[PDB]
């Protein structure tokens, strides 16, 4: 009944030293029934990464919408959109459906190509921006993620250390949520290289 917990799933993003990381589980379900273990919730438009949790039809719809909008942005601006600018676009786009909203929990992650500054942001379903320095969490196991991130996180982690921290935050949070899991992906993002790792986790 609650649209934000029909399909399940989680996304988490962290900042490190000259890097950012964004991760998600791979589950899609119809309440108790597991339907897909390949439903990735992280997308990217150039060097800007977007994770989306919530109702899966809206996740897919919003990805297609932001691809649409960032493609036109690029054609007109003659440059790729930046994390800070894209964050405002997501907020704008969500609030324009204020009284018929998309049931989602987006998370932006990326590095500004000019300043080199790491950036993350989170939103509620109608566009309110949470611009945290440390970490952003979203999904059916957001409480669990807040608990993991709050204790495991420390600032200025190197890329390869940040990977372990965010991976362990996601994994252990997902294992305490019935509607999350069935696989996981972690993106480690640097100014001009991005690595994507699929994690091994329990499949129940």
């Amino acid at each position: 009944s609650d649209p934000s917990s029909i399909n399940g799933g989680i996304v988490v993003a962290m900042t490190g030293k000259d890097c950012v990381a964004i991760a998600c589980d791979l589950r899609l379900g119809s309440q108790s029934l597991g339907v897909s273990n390949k439903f990735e919730k992280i997308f990217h438009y150039g060097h800007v990464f977007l994770g989306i949790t919530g109702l899966a039809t809206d996740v897919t719809t919003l990805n297609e919408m932001f691809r649409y909008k960032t493609n036109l942005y690029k054609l007109k601006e003659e440059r790729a959109i930046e994390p800070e600018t894209f964050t405002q676009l997501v907020s704008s786009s969500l609030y324009e459906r204020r009284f018929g909203p998309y049931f989602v929990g987006p998370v932006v992650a990326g590095i500004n190509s000019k300043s080199g500054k790491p950036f993350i942001a989170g939103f509620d379903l109608i566009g309110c921006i949470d611009e945290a320095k440390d970490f952003i969490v979203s999904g059916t196991a957001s409480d669990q993620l807040f608990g993991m991130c709050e204790s495991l996180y420390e600032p200025n982690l190197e890329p390869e250390d940040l990977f372990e921290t965010i991976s362990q935050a996601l994994l252990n949070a997902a294992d305490r949520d019935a509607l999350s899991g069935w696989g996981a992906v972690v993106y480690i993002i640097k100014k001009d290289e991005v690595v994507k790792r699929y994690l091994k986790m329990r499949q129940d």
Binding site: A80, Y95, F99, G122, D143, K196, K200
Partner: protein
């Protein structure tokens, strides 16, 4: 949320806490609740956070255009009239509860506005879940003809009352001082009385702790030449 507005000698000061919550969970521990409508007209919002931001930026946008059209610096009564007529039209469905303060050619002003479109005038105001804690302090220490320094003190003390006594409020105190014939000074994290203590342990993992199935490079670059 705890937000206050206090009038003083030559201006007005507005203050707020920095906790944003999702029910009993703290989403952001250092939220910015002090918003700019125009350079010398600031407001603080309680209620639905997306509504308080959206309604400030919309009226702020229209206020800027109005300022340009009229070749005049924006007035607080204009921001107020525009806000209340917008909120009234949406019959309380836009859950924005604001305290609006500022200086303009007419003088210094302080207003509160509720989601349904009603407005109020005052020398001291409070709003949010910590408004009762804050108002207890304001009613105990407010007086006529406050100085700038006395008003900043009173305002931040009123926010502190909310921070310590209201569960919906916490973390830091933000302040913005709007004095007549001066630039408005925004004092982000004016007070920082809630720094987390050092943890007993480091939770930095050994590299290789996490099990990995696959690795791959993600192409973020555009299609290449040659």
């Amino acid at each position: 949320t705890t937000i206050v507005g206090v009038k003083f000698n030559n201006g007005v000061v507005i203050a707020a806490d920095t906790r944003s919550t999702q029910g009993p969970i703290v989403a952001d521990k250092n939220c910015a609740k002090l918003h700019r409508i125009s350079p010398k007209i600031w407001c603080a919002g309680a209620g639905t956070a997306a509504d308080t931001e959206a309604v400030t930026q919309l009226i702020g946008s229209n206020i800027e255009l109005h300022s340009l059209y009229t070749s005049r610096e924006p007035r607080v009564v204009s921001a107020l009239q525009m806000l209340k007529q917008h909120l009234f039209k949406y019959q309380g469905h836009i859950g924005a509860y604001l305290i609006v303060a500022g200086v303009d050619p007419t003088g210094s002003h302080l207003f509160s506005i509720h989601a349904h479109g009603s407005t109020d005038v005052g020398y001291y105001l409070s709003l949010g879940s910590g408004s009762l804690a804050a108002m207890a302090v304001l009613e105990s220490h407010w007086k006529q003809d406050l100085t700038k320094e006395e008003a900043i003190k009173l305002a931040s003390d009123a926010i502190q009352a909310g921070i310590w006594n209201d569960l919906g409020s916490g973390s830091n105190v933000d302040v913005c001082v709007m004095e007549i014939g001066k630039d408005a000074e925004y004092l982000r994290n004016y007070l920082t009385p809630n720094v987390r203590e050092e943890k007993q342990k480091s939770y930095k993992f050994p590299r290789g702790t996490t099990a990995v199935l696959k690795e791959s490079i993600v192409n973020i670059c555009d299609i290449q030449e040659e």
